[PDB]
Structures are given as structure tokens and as C-alpha cells.
Structure 1
Amino acid sequence: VRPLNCIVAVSQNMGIGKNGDLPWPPLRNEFKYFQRMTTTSSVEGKQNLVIMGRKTWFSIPEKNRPLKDRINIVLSRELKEPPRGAHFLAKSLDDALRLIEQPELASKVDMVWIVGGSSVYQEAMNQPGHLRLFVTRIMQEFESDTFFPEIDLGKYKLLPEYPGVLSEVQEEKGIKYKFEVYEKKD
């Protein structure tokens, strides 16, 4: 409910998006890691919470919205009411982060996950204080529209291991990938 955890899958060229969809064919095994990491709270009785941009929200297949068993917040400067299925709408990341720390949500919310928007990731990574980057390195180039911000290695430590994260190279449909975790304290 206070460290911010970004989670992203990125191609070798830092691509995250193409024509409102993913640059690569569906990687169902990588999506399982995304689901497990974002959904698993550390506390029974609390849910994790996901914050996303409006484009990312409408890019999720409808049959999969809201991201089930997570509290879903959508950021939009133009919507007046939350999208159908979304739990909260906020007009800024700052509004979202203030909401999450309200006492009425304390009993309710465990981990906070930033799940995209390029500009949502950008803003999250501008924040002072405790950040983690859960980065899936897709070890291939793909034609891309939208990109992940540079990861400053002076600022983010690459953790040698992280609980519940396997470090071996994975592969699906001939596409190799691996899970990394970065951390910026303070």
C-alpha cells in the first residue's frame, strides 16, 4: 500500500506496445507470471491493487476486465466516471496514490502494482521513495509503438534474487525471456 511496484514485459529494443496491443504473439506463460505477481497479496483478507492508464485498460480484452481479485484503478483526464468494471477512476497518479493511503483502504489493500501506460511507468519512476521494477526481459527485438523508460543503474539495484521469482531463462513459442527485479529505496 506504499512501495510502488511497476511490472512490465519489454523487448530488447525496450518496446512494450504496438497498435494498442503487445508487440509479440501472446505469451500465456509470461502472463501467468504477471497474474501471479500482481494478484498474490502477502496478507489474507487484503487485495493487491493495480493502477493503469486508460489505453492499457481498454487494451485488456473485455472478457478479462477488471483484472480479477485485484482492486483496479484507471487514470484518465477525460473520463468522468470509472469505466464499467473498474473500481476507481483518478485524474492523476498523485490522486491515485493519495487515495490508496486513505484509512478506509488500509484494511483493504496490500501491494500496489503499476501495470502500464508508458507515461504511467514514467511518472511512477519519477516518485521519491521506495520503488521496485519487475521487468520481464523478452530476449528478442519486436516492432514497437510505445516503450519503457530507461532504467538508471545508478538509481535501481538489480536484485540477485527476489522471493517467489525464478531466475532461469524461460522460453515459450521459441521466444526466450527471463524475470528481473530492480529496487530503488528511500
Structure 2
Amino acid sequence: VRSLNSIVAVCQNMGIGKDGNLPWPPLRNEYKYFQRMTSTSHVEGKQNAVIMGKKTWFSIPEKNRPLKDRINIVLSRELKEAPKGAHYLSKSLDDALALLDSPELKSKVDMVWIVGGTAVYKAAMEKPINHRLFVTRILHEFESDTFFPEIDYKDFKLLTEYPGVPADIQEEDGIQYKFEVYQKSV
């Protein structure tokens, strides 16, 4: 594919999950940002694709699956068929990537977003392809059991601004966070 996008929200310890869910209670505005970013295509007639791991898939309440308006791909080495509601099952990112470029999809897909978890982010970060990482930094610590992998600051440069991403510190429910965009160029 031409370029990847990854989106994640992380707390001060780099935690992204806890017991199958997020480490913090619901943040409405942060979640709508994720929805807007992943859902918005810049081409009429195309939709974005979201790739995620098996635990992330199952972390979404059943009635809310598949994430509306996007093509859902789940990654799994153990499953045989796409879980009920997902559009495609792939055995590795490479395969999800090759699927995307296939004839039937290529013409249907605008952006590719990586939505986690850990091993998915890591794999995508390592591909020698152009990539933008949209990070929400939550300026607090929450107990976590799942963490975001280390980003190579020599490769991923923090942008000082980017179209449609607020620059100031945000606050909601007594919590502060900031949006950051890192860009890797090959």
C-alpha cells in the first residue's frame, strides 16, 4: 500500500488497555475523534479500512460490530473464518496488505488505519512504508496490562501542526490529553 496510518490513545505509562478494555472510563470526545479520523475518506465511493487484532475485535461490544462505515479486517493465526460481522480475516499484516491491493478492494478503499493492539502496531511500524501515527497522549497514569510499543523517534518525527487536529491540551471529565501526529517518510 502507499501509506499507513495508525491511531491509538495512551496514558503516561504507555498503557493502552486493561482486562480486555481501556484503562480509563469513557472519554466521549476522544472516542468521537477516533471515529471521525478512521471513518472519513477523501473520495466519494470509497471507505477506509481498519485492521485490528483478535482481542481488539472482541473488545468492541457485539452490537457495535463491525465498526460502521469502514471495512473491518481482523488478524488471527488461530481463526479459520472471519468472526461474525468482520469483513475479512488475514493471517498476518502482510496478507492484510496484499488483500488491500487486490483488485476487488483496491478500488473500494481510501485509507488504511491500524487500530491495534500491541503486536499489530509494532508490525506496522516496522514496515518500510510511509506512515502517520496519530497519538492521543492522556496526561495521567492508569493501571494497564497492555502497552504501546516504543516508537523510533529517529524515524517518526512529531509534526508541530496538522490539518484538523487541535493543538491545545484538551480536557474532559477532569482529565487532560493532547493530540500528536508523528510522520515516518521513506
Q: Using structure 1 for the length normalisation, give the TM-score.
A: 0.98
Query: Residues 77 and 92 of structure 1 are in contact (CA less than 8 Å); yes or no, is this contact kept in structure 2?
Result: yes
Please give the residue correspondences for 1:34-113 in structure 2 after superposition, counting only pairs within 5 Å.
Answer: 34-113=34-113
Report how far residue 2 of structure 1 moved: 2.8
Report how far residue 16 of structure 1 moved: 0.1
Q: How many residues align?
A: 186
Percent identity of equivalent pairs: 76
CA RMSD of aligned residues (A): 0.8
Equivalent residue number for residue 175 of structure 1: 175
SS of corresponding position for 1:176 = strand
Structure 1 runs of 4+ aligned residues shifted over 4 Å read none
The letter for the 1-side match of 2:52 is M
Equivalent residue number for residue 123 of structure 1: 123
Pair 1:27 & 2:27 matched: yes
C-alpha distance after superposition, 1:89-142 (max 9, x if no partner): 001111001111112212200000000111100111111020111000000011
Q: Which runs of 5+ in 2 are unaligned?
A: none
Please give the residue correspondences for 1:6-21 in structure 2 after superposition, counting only pairs within 5 Å.
Answer: 6-21=6-21
CA distance in 1, matches of 2:44, 2:13: 39
> In terms of mean alpha carbon deviation, does 63-72 or 159-168 score higher?
159-168
Q: Which runs of 5+ in 1 are unaligned?
A: none
The letter for the 2-side match of 1:159 is L
